[PDB]
Design an enzyme around this catalytic site. Sequence first.
Site, PDB file in Angstrom:
ATOM      1  CG  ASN A   1      -8.617   6.877  -4.823  1.00  0.00           C
ATOM      2  OD1 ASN A   1      -7.715   6.200  -5.336  1.00  0.00           O
ATOM      3  ND2 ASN A   1      -8.845   6.888  -3.511  1.00  0.00           N
TER       4      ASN A   1
ATOM      5  CD  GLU B   1      -3.121  -0.784   0.166  1.00  0.00           C
ATOM      6  OE1 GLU B   1      -3.159   0.277  -0.482  1.00  0.00           O
ATOM      7  OE2 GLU B   1      -3.949  -1.696  -0.011  1.00  0.00           O
TER       8      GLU B   1
ATOM      9  CB  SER C   1     -12.292   8.858  -1.741  1.00  0.00           C
ATOM     10  OG  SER C   1     -11.684   7.823  -2.496  1.00  0.00           O
TER      11      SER C   1
ATOM     12  CG  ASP D   1      -6.718   5.311  -0.968  1.00  0.00           C
ATOM     13  OD1 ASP D   1      -7.864   5.221  -0.481  1.00  0.00           O
ATOM     14  OD2 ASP D   1      -6.421   4.898  -2.105  1.00  0.00           O
TER      15      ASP D   1
ATOM     16  CG  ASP E   1     -13.926   7.464  -4.995  1.00  0.00           C
ATOM     17  OD1 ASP E   1     -12.808   8.002  -5.018  1.00  0.00           O
ATOM     18  OD2 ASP E   1     -14.208   6.555  -4.193  1.00  0.00           O
TER      19      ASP E   1
END
Length: 130
Positions: free
Chosen positions: A46, A35, A51, A53, A49
């Site tokens: 992202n 990750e 959003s 991380d 959408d």
Amino acid sequence: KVFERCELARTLKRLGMDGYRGIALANWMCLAKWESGYNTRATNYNAGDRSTDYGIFQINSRYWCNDGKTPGAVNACHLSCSALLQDNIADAVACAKRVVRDPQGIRAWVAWRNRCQNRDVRQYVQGCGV
């Protein structure tokens, strides 16, 4: 902060991640490696959408933490996403424990399915003294 492999392994064990909800320590190591490369300041937007991380476990702002700019978002970990960018991973660990409390468990991260599931993950903790 960019953790060294065994340093992170020992840190996660001390935070109670070994066997949490049936998840072996090596799986958490494999997850962090893919990750973020063990980097606590890693962030990834992202565009699809809206959003983002955040942190060593790349926890998403739509469901887990609040960054204020993600549409229709919830904050299940009751934390500012800022907390997931600290050098001290205590908050990140507390939130990752929350994520796996959901029915999907560790499978909630697609990267785990692609790079860790059904594989020999021993290599991630070998020689670390954990």
